[PDB]
């Protein structure tokens, strides 16, 4: 039940740091703010690691064997994580701002660029058990006079080229005996040396500077020494080289400039293979695949991630995420897709499994406040502060209709009739609820009666009534449909911030400014429950706050709430560092989730370190922009009083951890919470827990297998469910012969019927046995169709999962099968000649 | 003795075991090396932050520690190890069974004295060698020469002389020549300590009867005599800060400071360290500093500082007494109870027989702190009753903690020995709370529990009554009276609905907490000793007196699993966080892991010392245990968190002597195909079908909007001219005649050769296998390159290949896709020559198989018709 | 070398160009191109391949021999003989040099009559369809397949990588046999894209 | 990186990122000394009234 775990982070594909390709080239590792996301491009799967740094990630790297990953934040704190087990081995603090980290191509050693020192360590063995100090230092080198920009390993794991801000590139030998071989310093660059590389033969060294000059170094007579034989120049009018990478095998040089355009060059000929522009923002990181055919670029400002196939001039990947902009989220009725509304004015559809944006919409001028799906699922509606409500048709991606009030009011909430024939929106400056007809676009009527701004709306899925709440400390139930219009106001102790409607349509829950979740009976208009939440909410002290978090009344209330589809749980979130999951009938907190652990976000900590405080004030509040070397970083475009609705540069204050919306997955035991860092998705998919139901001493994994060998299929299946082991259920499920399926399905106890249906839906979506699963579903529906009808809300999520399997994969197969049948008949029956 | 699930990680809470610590200087900084059982720890003197710990535990307990610059020398049994940064660099093994006792390193000489009055000298092989390794000679002190060796010291400016200090007198040995240069006069009192003075030729000697001697070796005569009657000197040290001070530590736990210039006592620090544990085992002035570091056997390390004099003139006379600066410590006796404070593995709660409760930090030792016992002022206003002389609370038998309401009010309950009430603590404040919970039936507290919400505290009395208090207000709310004997366990489910109790009378009571009703009562064969409740799974295990662990499901009130095998009483046990394992410890010196799904013991350990407590981390990463000996907490790492562990039952007989693979690893891999008649999709991503059909349109979207700029002068064969890997279809090399359109022999593609081979052999299994492996781009290229000219052999063969594939019923959704691509690329060719017999016959056979695969449509249409109807109406 | 340093099959297909000696006969129409280009043909053969080069004015043939004391690569003679043949077939010198520099280039040779027995105007029409107006069709095949083609009357010579010159052959054959031009041009667009793609 | 001029305005001392310190004669504009190689680049230079040359 209430065993949820962070699974993946949508809405963001790249924030900062260096993106790295997996050695096989089929996975891309991208730092997403405080965590690391892994995208499997070939299998179309993604996952984000659970471990969390305390500041944004700065450098990451995965060894060639693909077993160990090291991630370093901006303070030098490092985490060594076992890639296969997705578990943290050790935490290491390098006590300095490490700029780059790179495993040796052998895998035995990895090097650190920590300021002006190059640190070489020995890799802990993955097979060995965890110890107090797994890392063993190998050597620390101090030749550079300023910070090291980057480092490069030789192909034989023997030499390291380091490039620093000293306008110099310097070479080291990993073995002390070979120090004489490489003890040279490469000079002559006017600006910072961004990158230095070896040729494939390792007889040539290329160095690239920020000013845009490439130097080709060779060991030649003037008696033999390294000399700049050739010099090439990027004649960029004002753009500076921002990131450089080189692939020795293909002799490919990919350079990213601050103007937002990158060039591919062929060395040592300096031939311009390509030149493209991703936008106006700098290209922060560039990486090359092992084969050399895929190039990954990332821009931090807009959070872009571009994987380019320079061979075919095609985009394997082209994605852009949102940071501190997602105002709302919506699941598709089948749960395959999740939509997000951003302050930019853009609505994006994200795929849960792959983790990429399928489509984008840019009709809205201003921030989009709400997004909601029709019951049917084809059509989508969104509202924005520009004063328009827009209906979207997903099959053709057209804004087939747009609604607008006569007085040009900003809209902050939205509700859609289950029939999809009426749309109602509310505002924070009108006090009325505007209603439109979907087919016509005409404003049917304006509902009046609230003495304060309308904060939220919702239609009852069955009864089709409308529930609205306002800061007027009241809730009104509108019976808009029917010959007679009736309104039933219900008073509440404080301002209502959120509202959730029961799937039954019989009760409504409201989150108030007091930190209370009160449940009312719609038909009787009397309170049936109340949950106290002020104590549960975790709220952090801001750096700018002059008052404690305990005394702070900033956010001790939930601005968004949602029911579980069964109707027994509420998930709540707000402008706070907590997501709380309550149980409605018993009014207890099932679990609390910490949204973020990033000290970059302002509201993470309840207590701040007193060392930061000084006689002047907090050390964090001091602006260090002037120290930055680049002019663009020094420029301050912040408006004095802006709080929201502008770019991050405009605010001048740190982003605040907050949850804008939360929802349950229609088809799975998971919920998604839109927050500043992105769309966090918590799911119960792993199911490592042992949660038996109705065991006895006789029930055992051994006993179930004995039943199978004796051909007692029903008993074997039931005993598997009583253990509730996924592997044992799968073993029994596939061992039942086809002839015996109808007999077993008709005889399964009613108690275990919801469990089998859940397993089939989750198993069928990704399994290969399409026909076997369809036989089981046919047997179950025919045998127990009436029972499922009597209890719709117990079986709602399971049924939606089965329908998704029958629609999204099964129908696609027969559609490809059936068209061949007709294409076949035309070719043979028809007469072809001349 | 070796576990397959757990491995030792380190010990927590131990700073020193009483062996004199060693001080070494790196540049201006200082560090202290302290012994902890079989391992040593290095602290930074400025902050007392742990820096390094010995990589591996020595086979035998360490006896001596000497540190010089980066290298540290640790002596154990007859071997002396050399360590740098906690990693052993070289091990010196002496050639006699006599154990090393004392250790001295000056220059290139390492002197090790065994308990048989034999001194072994080791020398550096090379002058520039970092540490001595080579064996030089052996010097033995006979009984006629002197008594038992007290310590080895080297005085400055002495070429190759070792000042051996014995109980009877002092001796001067020349290590290079191995000769006795000088023998001091006999001393009436036994010598116990020696310390070289900062002056030349003078070594301070401490006797057993409170006498300190400034013996001068050059003159061989006494210089001074300090007297400390009825005391025993344990340590000596001089102040090198420019003030002639001498600090004398005593076994009584006192530290005296003398002013040598003025012949006066500056101050005496009383009871800095316990007399029971050896008092002041080591007290050393930091070189050139006013800071003095003290240690003792009570698991504590302290630092004191001398402040500047307050008098502008005569600062020498007006000496400020030493001030406590900083210290590190832990329990003085083994912990009695332990608990994990939070969901993460940051902090652990510990209680010991020394009447002190500690909060230990796993992530950093400096964060470890002791919770205060200062009492709050009573709310009523009456004077609190207690002795004016302050004493610590009695030993803690039980503890219960929650974090639902941390920072709001009390969130810990503790039970004390022979005490009729339970005390509360606050984790946020790290201080004892303001509430006390009484049994109200004249019985001692035997069990304490808290609800998940953090509002209620449950107390179980030895007389059988369960009292329920409110943590916020400390007001008694409810009282349950079912048990007639002591209640040894109380637990409440996460939902705050059903409550469970157990007692020595053997009954297990089930209560409805909200309705306050007796849901049921269950009687067990033997008295119950302890309870652990797993809230997520609603399972709780009971340790019975018959040496069994009985797992019970609270929902149904029946025994589900019973565990046997322990040979003695079960001291403690704990659930795994996932609720799948139970790890239990017993008095028979074993820790067993039990797998609940199969109800058998999968792992077994033998501990040298009986483990008194066992606790899993809520993460599951770590397992913490405490033992009847040792002041620290043993932390184990859960290896199952990084790999699968077999659940095969352990061998009982072999374990006693020392004192279906998929099921074993709790996994199952789905079959390739359940039955031949059943249609099965391919083993791969489901987007491959979509990628193949709509490849062109997907690629058009991929192309950049604006054409990329490129240099006019570009190599035509750049893609091929690559130094050397790309495995694309383009990068294919021929394998080894009349020209043939499809491919000339010796110049033919791999796919076409497979196709022709299959046609003759009348089986395309090899061809179908490689088709599935082809990339979507490669698949399109091969089909489109098929020969489209008469007699149309390749097209006919391909249709025969796909027709065979549909018979197998495996990967059929690719075979449908391949046939769809064939019509797309060669539909006109087939249409123009539909009357050709070969194409007509091959096509007809494909339809015969394809017609059969229409049952799948019926299954899909049925389920949509019903599933839509069932969910809607 | 820098201190950081690390520690007889015939490419041409369809004609048997094969101390060893190789002889390549130069037709009359390639005599003058050989003369003006000779200054650039012998240096790579004599220096890189360490071969003993000669052209026999009497027999109008180019003679290559392996020098046992100088030559080190056993395949140099065959590689040199292959390179001279490409120039003999008509390929530009820079195109011929690609054979020496690279290791994965072959020449595929066939005649129009091999594909189909065309005579008179039909044969001329077939050659025209391959070339197209201003050589557009042949040029299109070169860029898409990344192959160099020499259409000497009814004799076609295709230079490039194995798979590359395979796709050119089907396009040329379809043009000979008379498939509709749009299908061939549509073919050339896809094969260009698919060939460069990683997957 | 840094420039220093004496009180009399006759000499100048300049340090560069190339690890070189050069003493100049700014009345006649003649280079007097060039300490070509320094252990590390000199961040700062100053000249006192008495004429002491300081380097960091």
């Amino acid at each position: 039940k209430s065993d949820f775990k962070f699974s993946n982070l949508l809405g963001t594909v790249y924030r900062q740091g260096n993106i790295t390709f997996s050695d096989d080239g089929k996975q891309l590792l991208s730092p997403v703010g405080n965590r690391v996301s892994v995208f499997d491009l070939i299998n179309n799967k993604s996952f984000t690691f659970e471990y969390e740094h305390r500041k944004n990630i700065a450098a990451i790297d995965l060894n060639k064997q693909g077993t160990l990953l090291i991630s370093i934040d901006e303070d030098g704190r490092a985490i060594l994580v076992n890639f296969k087990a997705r578990n943290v081995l050790h935490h290491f603090n390098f006590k300095e701002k490490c700029s780059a980290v790179k495993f040796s191509p052998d895998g035995r050693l990895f090097a650190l660029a920590s300021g002006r020192f190059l640190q070489i360590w020995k890799t802990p063995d993955v097979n060995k058990d965890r110890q107090f100090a797994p890392f063993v230092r190998h050597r620390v080198h101090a030749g550079h006079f300023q910070d090291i920009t980057s480092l490069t390993w030789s192909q034989d794991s023997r030499f390291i080229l380091t490039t620093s801000k000293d306008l110099s590139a310097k070479i080291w030998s990993v073995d002390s005996e070979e120090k004489n071989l490489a003890a040279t310093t490469f000079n002559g660059h006017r600006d910072y040396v961004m990158g230095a590389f070896f040729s494939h033969d390792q007889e040539k060294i290329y160095t690239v500077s920020k000013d845009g000059a490439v130097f080709v170094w060779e060991f030649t007579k003037r008696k033999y020494s390294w000399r700049i034989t050739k010099k090439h120049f990027f004649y960029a009018n004002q753009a500076k080289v921002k990131c450089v990478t080189f692939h020795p095998a293909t002799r490919l040089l990919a350079v990213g400039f601050t103007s937002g355009e990158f060039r591919l060059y062929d060395l040592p000929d300096f031939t311009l293979i390509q030149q493209l522009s991703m936008g106006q923002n700098p290209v922060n990181t560039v990486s090359v695949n092992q084969t050399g055919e895929w190039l990954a670029f990332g821009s931090s400002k807009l959070g872009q991630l571009l994987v380019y196939e320079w061979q075919s001039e095609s985009y394997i990947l082209k994605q852009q995420g949102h940071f501190d902009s997602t105002n709302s989220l919506a699941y598709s009725p089948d749960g395959s897709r999740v939509v997000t509304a951003s302050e930019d004015g853009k609505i994006k559809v994200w795929d849960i499994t792959s983790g990429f944006c399928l489509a984008t919409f840019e009709e809205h001028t201003s921030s989009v406040t709400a997004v909601q799906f029709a019951k049917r699922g084809q059509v989508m509606f969104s509202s924005s502060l520009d004063g328009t409500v827009r209906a979207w048709d997903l099959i053709r991606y057209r804004n087939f209709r747009t609604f607008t009030g006569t007085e040009r009011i900003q809209f902050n909430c939205l509700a859609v009739d289950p029939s999809g024939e009426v749309v109602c929106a509310g505002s924070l400056d009108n006090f009325d609820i505007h209603v439109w007809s979907v087919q016509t676009g005409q404003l049917l009527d304006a509902l009046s009666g609230h003495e304060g701004p309308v904060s939220c709306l919702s239609f009852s899925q069955e009864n089709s009534v409308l529930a609205s709440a306002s800061w007027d400390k009241t809730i009104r139930i509108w019976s808009i449909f029917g010959r007679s219009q009736q309104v039933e106001p219900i008073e509440v102790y404080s301002d209502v911030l959120a509202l959730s409607m029961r799937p039954d349509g019989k009760e409504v829950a409201v989150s108030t400014l007091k930190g209370q979740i009160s449940i009312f009976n719609i038909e009787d208009a009397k309170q049936v429950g109340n949950i106290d939440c002020r104590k549960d909410i975790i709220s952090g002290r801001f750096n700018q706050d002059r008052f404690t978090a305990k005394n702070s009344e900033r956010s001790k209330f939930f601005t968004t709430i949602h029911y579980s589809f069964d109707g027994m749980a509420i998930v709540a979130g707000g402008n706070n560092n907590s997501i709380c999951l309550y149980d409605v009938p018993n009014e207890v907190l099932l679990k609390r989730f910490i949204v973020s652990r990033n000290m970059a976000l302002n509201g993470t900590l309840e207590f701040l370190n007193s060392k930061k405080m000084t006689e002047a004030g907090s050390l964090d509040l001091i602006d260090d922009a002037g120290e930055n070397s680049d002019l663009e970083d020094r420029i301050d475009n912040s408006l004095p009083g802006s709080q929201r609705g502008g770019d991050l540069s405009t605010r001048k204050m740190r982003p605040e951890v907050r949850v804008t919306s939360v929802q349950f997955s229609p088809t799975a035991n998971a919920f998604a919470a839109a927050s500043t860092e992105g769309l966090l998705i918590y799911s119960t998919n792993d199911t490592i827990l042992f949660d038996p139901f109705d065991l006895d001493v006789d029930v055992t994994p051994h006993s179930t297998v004995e039943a199978l060998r004796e051909k007692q299929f029903l008993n074997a299946l039931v005993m598997a469910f009583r253990l509730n082991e996924e592997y044992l259920i799968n073993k029994v499920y596939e061992a039942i012969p086809i002839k015996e399926i109808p007999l077993v399905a008709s005889n399964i106890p009613a108690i275990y019927l919801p469990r089998i249906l859940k397993f089939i839906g989750d198993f069928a979506i990704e399994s290969q046995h399409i026909e076997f699963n369809l036989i089981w579903i046919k047997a179950l529906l025919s045998a127990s169709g009436g029972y499922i009808n009597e209890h719709k809300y117990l079986f709602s999520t399971a049924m939606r999962s089965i329908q998704r399997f029958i629609v999204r994969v099964a129908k696609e197969v027969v559609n490809t099968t059936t068209d061949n049948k007709y294409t076949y008949r035309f070719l043979v029956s028809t007469d072809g000649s001349m | 003795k070796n576990s397959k699930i757990f491995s030792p990680f380190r010990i927590i809470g131990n700073v020193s075991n009483g062996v004199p610590f060693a001080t070494g200087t790196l540049g201006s900084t200082f560090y202290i090396v302290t012994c902890v059982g079989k391992t040593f720890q290095i602290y930074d003197a400025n902050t007392l932050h742990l820096l390094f710990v010995s990589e591996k535990e020595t086979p035998s307990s360490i006896v001596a520690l000497s540190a010089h610059f980066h290298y540290v020398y640790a002596a154990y049994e007859n071997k002396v190890g050399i360590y740098k940064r906690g990693i052993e660099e070289h091990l010196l093994e002496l050639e006699t069974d006599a154990n090393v006792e004392h250790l001295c390193i000056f220059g290139d000489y390492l002197c090790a004295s065994t308990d048989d009055n034999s001194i072994f000298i080791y020398k550096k092989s090379d002058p520039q060698d970092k540490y001595p390794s080579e064996f030089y000679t052996k010097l033995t002190v006979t009984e006629i020469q002197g008594g038992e060796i007290v310590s080895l010291q080297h005085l400055a400016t002495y070429l190759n002389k070792l000042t051996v200090v014995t109980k009877s007198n002092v001796l001067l040995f020349n290590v290079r020549t191995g000769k006795l240069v000088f023998t001091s006069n006999e001393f009436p009192d036994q010598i116990t300590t020696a310390e070289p003075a900062p002056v030349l030729d003078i070594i301070a000697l401490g006797t057993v009867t409170g006498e300190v001697i400034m013996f001068n070796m050059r003159k061989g005569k006494r210089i001074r005599t300090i007297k400390i009657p009825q005391s025993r000197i344990s340590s000596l040290s001089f102040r090198t800060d420019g003030s002639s001070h001498l600090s004398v530590g005593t076994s009584s736990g006192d530290l005296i400071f003398y002013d040598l210039d003025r012949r006066s006592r500056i101050h005496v620090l009383k009871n800095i360290h316990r007399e029971s544990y050896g008092g002041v085992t080591q007290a050393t002035f930091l070189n050139g500093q006013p800071i003095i570091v003290t240690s003792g056997g009570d698991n504590s390390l302290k630092e004191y500082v001398f402040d500047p004099s307050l008098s502008q003139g005569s600062g020498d006379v007006v000496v400020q007494p030493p001030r406590y600066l900083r210290s590190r410590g832990g329990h003085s006796q083994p912990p009695s109870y332990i608990a994990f404070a939070d969901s993460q593995s940051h902090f652990m709660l510990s209680a010991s027989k020394d009447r002190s409760l500690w909060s230990f930090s796993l992530r950093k030792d400096a964060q470890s702190q002791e919770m205060s016992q200062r009492l709050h002022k009573k709310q009523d206003g009456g004077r609190v009753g207690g002795s004016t002389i302050k004493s610590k609370f009695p030993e803690i038998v039980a503890l219960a903690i929650e974090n639902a309401r941390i920072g709001e009010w009390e969130n810990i309950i503790t039970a004390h020995k022979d005490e009729k009430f339970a005390r509360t603590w606050d984790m946020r404040n790290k201080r004892v709370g303001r509430w006390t919970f009484d049994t109200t039936d004249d019985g001692f507290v035997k069990s304490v529990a808290m609800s998940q919400c953090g509002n209620f505290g449950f107390i179980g009395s030895s007389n059988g009554s369960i009292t329920i208090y409110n943590m916020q207000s400390g007001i008694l709310r409810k009282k349950y009276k079912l048990h007639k004997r002591a209640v040894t366990g109380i637990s409440l489910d996460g939902m705050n609905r059903k409550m469970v109790s157990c007692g020595l009378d053997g009954i297990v009571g089930f209560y409805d907490f909200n309705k306050s009703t007796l849901l049921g009562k269950l009687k067990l064969d033997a008295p119950i000793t302890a309870m652990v409740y797993h809230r997520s799974s609603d399972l709780f295990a009971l340790a019975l007196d018959d040496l069994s662990i009985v797992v019970i499901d609270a929902v149904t009130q029946r025994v589900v699993r019973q565990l046997w095998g322990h040979s003695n009483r079960i001291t403690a046990f704990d659930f795994s966080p996932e609720g799948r394992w139970i790890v239990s410890a017993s008095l028979d010196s074993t820790i067993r892991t039990w797998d609940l799904p199969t109800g058998g013991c999968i792992d077994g350990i033998i501990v040298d010392n009986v483990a008194t407590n066992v606790k899993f981390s809520p993460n599951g990463d770590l397992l913490a245990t405490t033992h009847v000996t040792g002041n620290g907490i043993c932390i184990w790492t859960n290896r199952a968190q990084f790999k699968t562990v077999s659940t095969r039952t352990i061998d009982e007989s072999e374990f006693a002597r020392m004192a279906l693979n998929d099921i074993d690893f709790n996994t199952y891999t789905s079959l390739e195909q359940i039955d031949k008649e059943l249609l099965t999709l391919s083993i791969g991503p489901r987007s491959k079908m979509n990628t193949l059909l709509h490849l062109d349109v997907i690629r058009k979207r991929s192309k950049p909007k604006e054409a990329p700029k490129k240099s006019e002068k570009l190599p035509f064969f750049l893609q091929l001219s690559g130094e050397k890997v790309r495995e694309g279809i383009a990068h294919e090399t021929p394998e080894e005649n009349k020209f043939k359109v499809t491919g000339r022999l010796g110049f033919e593609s791999h796919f076409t050769k497979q196709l022709r081979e299959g046609s003759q052999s009348k089986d395309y299994s090899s061809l179908l296998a490689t088709l599935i492996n082809f990339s979507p781009a490669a698949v399109d290229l091969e089909i489109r390159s098929l020969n489209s000219f008469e007699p149309f052999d390749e097209i006919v063969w391909f249709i025969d290949a796909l027709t065979q594939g549909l018979k197998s019923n495996k990967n059929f959704e690719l075979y449908e896709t391949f046939m769809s691509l064939l019509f797309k690329a060669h539909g006109d060719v087939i249409h123009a020559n539909n009357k050709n017999q070969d194409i007509a016959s091959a096509l007809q056979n494909w339809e015969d198989v394809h017609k059969k695969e229409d049952r799948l449509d019926d299954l899909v249409k049925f389920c949509m018709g019903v599933a839509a109807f069932v969910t809607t109406a | 070398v820098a201190p950081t340093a690390l520690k007889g099959s015939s490419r041409i297909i369809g004609i048997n160009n094969t101390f060893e000696s190789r002889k390549i006969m130069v037709p009359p129409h390639r005599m003058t191109p050989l003369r003006n280009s000779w200054t650039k043909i012998y240096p790579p053969l004599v220096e890189h391949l360490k071969l003993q080069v000669r052209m026999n004015l009497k027999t109008k043939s180019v003679e290559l021999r392996t020098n046992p004391k100088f030559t080190t690569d056993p395949g140099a003679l065959q590689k040199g003989a292959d390179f001279i043949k490409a120039f003999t077939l008509g390929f530009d010198l820079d195109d011929s040099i690609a054979l020496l520099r690279l290791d994965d280039l072959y020449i595929e040779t066939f005649e129009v009559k091999d594909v189909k027995t065309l005579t008179g105007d039909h044969l001329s029409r077939a050659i025209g369809r391959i070339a197209g107006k201003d050589g557009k069709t042949k040029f299109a095949i070169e860029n898409a397949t990344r192959t160099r083609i020499v259409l000497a009357d009814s004799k076609i010579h295709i230079l490039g990588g194995f798979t590359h010159i395979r796709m050119a052959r089907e396009s040329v054959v379809s043009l000979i046999l008379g498939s509709p031009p749009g299908k061939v041009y549509g073919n050339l667009r896809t094969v260009a894209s698919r060939l460069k793609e990683r997957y | 990186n840094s420039i220093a001029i004496d009180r009399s305005g006759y000499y100048m001392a300049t340090t560069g990122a190339d690890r070189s310190m050069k003493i100049w004669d700014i009345r006649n504009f003649k280079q007097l000394h060039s300490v070509e190689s320094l252990p590390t680049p000199g961040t700062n230079v100053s000249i006192s009234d008495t004429g002491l040359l300081a380097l960091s």
Side-chain angles (χ1 to χ4, degrees), chain B residues 102 146-153 163-171 184-195 203-213 215 217 222 232-234 236:
Chain B
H102 312 287
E148 300 295 329
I149 297 172
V150 165
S151 68
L152 306 180
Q153 302 304 124
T163 311
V164 183
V165 181
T166 70
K167 293 177 177 179
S168 69
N169 59 351
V170 183
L171 308 171
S184 169
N185 287 356
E186 289 77 4
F187 296 91
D189 275 352
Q190 167 182 352
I191 305 176
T192 59
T193 311
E195 197 273 356
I203 180 168
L205 298 155
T207 77
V208 71
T209 57
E211 186 177 1
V212 182
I213 294 92
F215 183 82
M217 311 275 318
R222 210 169 285 205
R232 186 154 173 284
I233 299 98
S234 57
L236 294 170

Side-chain angles (χ1 to χ4, degrees), chain C residues 54-188:
Chain C
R54 180 177 179 271
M55 201 275 288
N56 190 1
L57 287 161
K58 182 62 66 68
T59 65
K60 277 74 71 177
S61 171
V62 180
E63 307 312 278
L64 277 296
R65 305 194 311 189
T66 301
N67 195 351
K69 186 191 78 80
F70 282 79
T71 314
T72 71
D73 178 20
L77 189 69
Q78 181 58 36
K79 177 175 279 292
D82 288 343
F83 154 67
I84 292 294
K85 184 73 182 296
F87 190 94
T88 285
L89 294 171
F91 290 98
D92 296 330
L93 182 53
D94 55 352
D95 306 355
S96 311
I97 295 168
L99 290 175
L100 302 174
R101 308 307 110 192
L102 285 91
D103 289 350
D104 294 354
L105 285 175
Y106 314 131
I107 301 184
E108 189 273 332
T109 303
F110 69 99
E111 292 80 6
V112 173
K113 47 155 198 184
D114 272 316
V115 178
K116 183 175 177 179
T117 56
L118 297 165
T119 64
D121 300 355
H122 304 270
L123 177 54
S124 304
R125 274 280 169 185
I127 298 170
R129 207 182 310 95
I130 299 165
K133 185 171 177 65
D134 281 358
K136 80 177 194 195
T137 313
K138 184 232 291 183
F139 201 62
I141 299 154
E142 290 181 351
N143 294 288
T145 68
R146 306 290 289 168
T147 52
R148 296 258 192 215
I149 308 172
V150 167
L151 178 58
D153 190 0
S154 303
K155 284 152 41 83
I156 301 98
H157 299 286
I158 310 180
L159 167 59
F162 169 54
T163 308
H164 295 287
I165 67 187
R166 172 176 84 140
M167 311 295 328
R169 157 166 73 270
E170 291 76 71
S171 43
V172 170
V173 167
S174 311
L175 288 167
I176 293 157
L177 288 180
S179 81
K183 157 158 197 182
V184 184
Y185 271 100
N187 203 48
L188 281 168

Side-chain angles (χ1 to χ4, degrees), chain B residues 565-585:
Chain B
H566 284 283
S567 176
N568 207 339
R569 182 176 69 88
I570 306 169
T571 65
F573 61 104
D574 211 28
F575 265 96
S576 178
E578 63 264 19
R580 182 182 308 275
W581 291 343
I582 286 177
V583 176
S584 52

